[PDB]
Amino acid sequence: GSHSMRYFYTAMSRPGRGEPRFIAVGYVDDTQFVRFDSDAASPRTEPRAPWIEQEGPEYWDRNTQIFKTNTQTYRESLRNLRGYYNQSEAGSHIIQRMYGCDLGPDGRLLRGHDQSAYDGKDYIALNEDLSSWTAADTAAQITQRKWEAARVAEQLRAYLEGLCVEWLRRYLENGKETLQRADPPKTHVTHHPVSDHEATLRCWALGFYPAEITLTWQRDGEDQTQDTELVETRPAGDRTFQKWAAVVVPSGEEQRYTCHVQHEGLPKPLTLRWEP
């Protein structure tokens, strides 16, 4: 596919410091577009991308009520899970939920998602059929029986195949100038001598969007996977991302190394080498 929408919910308990905080953020691919934080002075869904601002008041009030309602329900869920694990009321815990729909390059639903975790460990996930569940342990099994008894999967499937895809296509259109524009990485190779016989070659990729990218060093047509230092793609703060890969090589042998860059924004993969 080529596009997706995801909402990320995080509910954190904090005994002795008030009720569980609830935060929600929505994304279309790698662009955030809305947020809600129950700790804000005046909790309300707020815009985070230019193209979502045009939505009318009903949009924002509808969103805010959902997140306010969720704020309460997740506090109940945190109490439920604490009990499911026989945990103390003195510890802080976290429930996380990710859900959304994937669209193919044509715009058709590729697949839907809905997974939760408790304290960073997978808890329960809606299967790809959008009809059954996979519970991680006997605690999640209680959440499962409860959600099957309430026909939750049926509601998620309707939203995932319905509203989810509908609004994503609307967002893709309203923000097409950016959401449907891939920015290729600006690439170059640096050289950092480490010792008399070794030097570091660092292949850079800057200003690209979306975040997906492939950066690899090859020695003699061959890949240096186990010998390549690859930093995690990082956000520049202007919607674009950065990434670099490094390899230490024998001085004099730098011309035997080539950097290969693959990115949606590139009509053809790139091959770079250090240019003294």
Binding site: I66, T69, T73, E76, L81, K146, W147, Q155, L156, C164
Partner: peptide, 10 residues
């Protein structure tokens, strides 16, 4: 737009 219908507690 987020999943609208009231969510069921875990």
């Amino acid at each position: 737009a987020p999943q609208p219908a009231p969510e069921n507690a875990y």
